[PDB]
Symmetry: C3
Subunit: 334 residues, 3 copies
């Protein structure tokens, strides 16, 4: 007999986040979301390597869901008949039934509706988990995203001061396991089922072939670079459902970071690089001080430069010579 | 001339913990423990793979030792003549002599008695360390456990409030390196000595064949699942003497977590997944809110599902529909 | 028009650190440093394995630079014509232009002068980053070091009390990727360019052949052991520009640790093992209580004992039997 107001959310594809309030005068609501599973072959690199992806809402990562502490999150999970496998959903933000996984197993052609109370604040992973060896395989195939549960008074610095972001981006990092043939080329497969045996053999060796942001090498570069202006406070939510990551903003800092991702704890200040434990999401806020190109990377630089894990920010504004200056340009040695 | 009262402890096999007080009105005591080394071939998986184990007290992990700050811990380490190698013990809780290792090297047929003052609170690893390349080999063969040093006033939340657990479990995670033959089957050996060359070659490649809790795949499942009731506050001590781990309670949380494991620091609150640095123990407390099956995993899901690192909790009590409910069971899509 | 006093620093090779004040009554200064790049073939192990190194100032790690909050750091980077490749420098302590990398790219025969304002306190990595796949390759070839930015009032414990160290050491950990030939011996190369193809293939597999402190197996052992006396408070700065590490002082503790390395955050107390995220530096302070040999390791014990990552401390002073004692020496079992 839960008679609270209902609110529908129109999810948007990462790295963007659906519109939301930080601090709110709204009381608890039932917030309604819909996720539709899509299994699909996608291209993950600039060489044309293909991958058997499985996704929530067609994206890797799945979209970021944003609610406030004490809301009830009501998700309709849909598994169309065009898919081949059973799927479910496990929210790390939720309490009971394996995070919802034990209540959401659906075959192709079915849907289910789960409600959970958002009793814990922070950013949290959600992922598919349809039992046994299928659990890692569905997650590393792309079936993961995140939810953010905000305090109703918004974020704070642990010393009584509000922290308000001007914009938020969600960076979902994906470790992928694409097998190679005898001569050393990546293999292509006709279905997720056909990719399973070779993929699992590689998975158990624990070394990914690719580590990407937003589903593909270079996804968050060029036309699709992240953007900001000097003076803007940007929140970057970072998740990794299976493997550790160490985010770093090249040329910047984490001014306020929740590396374990949970807003009941004060943020740490002034970090160079932070650590996202596999199976979690974290968040870092930075106020841009300088214009120009920044790279956002995992600071295993082999992964960042060679395996795919680099995003860019393009930042507009005025250069600050007090903070940094080229005193003397490259010249011949005296 | 140390004339304090003596107290003997009867150690018990993991995941259980010998009986102890949290807050105590006892003053410092000399607490007496005995560990007897056993080298033994064991089965580590449901396929019948064997492993040359080396253990404290016949178990992997070694038993949890519990004392209070300011106690003196007096350990009799015994290396029976039925063993083949020298062994020792290094306590991360202890100060000096390589943690005791430099004072406890014993050949088969010898015993030694070490006393150390428990000046640092928290959970800490202990492990064998008999010099050079033998150090990693004895540890990854199973020669590690943990000790817990409690404040005399018990645990607190860093904000002045007591945190009392209703029960404690010790989960020791073991990375194992079992070599394979040409056709790809795991190899069996007649002695630890015979397993050494092949095992060391694999170890140096840094990828385990198995990652297990309590010594074997499935050790903490079925009849041997962990248990709780709705409303019980459970402390889970987690150690990993060689390699990082990222614990996660599927369907729950870490309500209070000391991921670096040291009680001089306030716990973090409301975590989804925490991080145990290789060479350390950590502790997490959770009050169960929902009945049913939970899985406790490292959230590298490949390790958890495919390499062995999953435990279960079976929890009794009343389902809470406010926290989670299946609004609509699986049905055909409209 | 920046008219502050100038101060030159004479850098010294790691693990030592150039002389500096902790708390200072000096105001902001322009502190002047010079780094000269050297590409050179070096021996990294006791078997005589060679490696194509690239370094700042001829050392791995590069020297520790020490300044105070609000200083301006003016670095002359020199790339002599005896080198073969372009190089640059990226300071994680700096704000803008990819940490300075976008302003410091120099060919063999050129130098550049960069100034940045030290607005963030802590220890921070610096490394070369000359674009694309070259970034990881130059870093894992040895082109990284660290800078320490002290509060002007020196270090504190977060509870109002000064923490003053008696001496500081800088331990730079390097993951190295040396390829093997068919029969399994490590390969030697005539130039960094010639080592590139084989080295990159190995790098992308993410498993190092060697993990060393101060450039070589055994660098910080024997005549070159670290030293202290009972009663001395020693700060150990640890960096790792590419890969995670888990420092541990065998027989000691981290009395005060900033594992994310940033002095705006209070240190954690009483750690056994701490965690240095790849792409960062951290710092730990310990007051020695016992004489004798200590080992300082990463507590992946395979890396420590088998791949090269062990340093020693030799500590003078009086043994404390209250803290630890051998109650009974090794004797035959009754
Ligand atoms: O040329 C035959 C020879 O090649 C190997 C690979 O070294 O196997 C290749 O050819 C087989 C027969 O065509 C294929 O089945 C196999 O997939 C392919 O690798 C050898 O095993 C074989 O003797
Ligand atoms: O059949 C001989 C042929 O097999 C190889 C493996 O490819 O070696 C196998 O046989 C050897 C002789 O019986 C064994 O010593 C060895 O352990 C086994 O792998 C080849 O090396 C050999 O030419
Ligand atoms: O002995 C020839 C035989 O050896 C292999 C390695 O198994 O190749 C070796 O010899 C080649 C010719 O000398 C070299 O080019 C190569 O580098 C070396 O590995 C086989 O490929 C070849 O059939
Ligand atoms: Cu799925
Ligand atoms: Cu999960
Ligand atoms: Cu041993
Ligand atoms: Cu140890
Ligand atoms: Cu360089
Ligand atoms: Cu960097």
């Amino acid at each position: 007999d839960l008679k609270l107001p209902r609110q529908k959310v129109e999810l948007v594809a990462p790295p963007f986040v659906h519109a939301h309030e930080q601090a709110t005068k709204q009381g608890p609501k039932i917030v309604e979301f819909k996720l539709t599973i899509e299994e699909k072959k996608v291209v993950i690199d600039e060489k044309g390597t293909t991958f058997q992806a499985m996704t929530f809402n067609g994206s890797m990562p799945g979209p970021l869901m944003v609610v406030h502490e004490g809301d009830y999150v009501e998700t309709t999970l849909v598994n169309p008949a065009t898919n081949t496998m059973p799927h479910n959903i496990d929210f790390h933000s939720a309490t009971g039934a394996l995070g919802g996984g034990a209540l959401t197993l659906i075959n192709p052609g079915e849907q289910v509706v789960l409600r959970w109370k958002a009793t814990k604040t922070g950013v949290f992973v959600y992922h598919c988990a349809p039992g046994g060896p299928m659990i890692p395989w569905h997650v590393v195939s792309g079936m993961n995203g995140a939810v953010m549960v905000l305090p109703r008074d918004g974020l704070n610095d642990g010393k009584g001061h509000a922290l308000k972001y001007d914009k938020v981006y969600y960076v979902g990092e994906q470790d992928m396991y694409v097998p190679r043939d005898e001569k050393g080329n990546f293999k292509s497969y006709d279905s997720p089922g056909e990719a399973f045996t070779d993929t699992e053999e590689m998975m158990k060796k624990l070394i990914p072939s690719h580590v990407v942001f937003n589903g593909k090498v270079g996804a968050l570069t060029g036309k699709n670079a992240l953007t900001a202006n000097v003076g803007e406070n940007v929140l970057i939510v970072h998740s990794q459902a299976n493997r550790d990551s160490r985010p770093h903003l090249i040329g910047g800092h984490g001014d306020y970071v929740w590396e374990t991702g949970k807003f009941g704890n004060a943020p740490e200040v002034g970090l160079e690089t932070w650590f996202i434990r596999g199976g979690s999401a974290g968040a870092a806020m930075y106020k841009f001080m300088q214009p120009g190109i920044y790279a956002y990377v995992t600071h295993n630089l082999i992964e960042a430069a060679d395996l795919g894990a680099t995003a860019h920010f393009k930042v507009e504004g005025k250069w600050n010579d007090d903070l940094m200056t080229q005193v003397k340009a490259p010249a011949e040695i005296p």
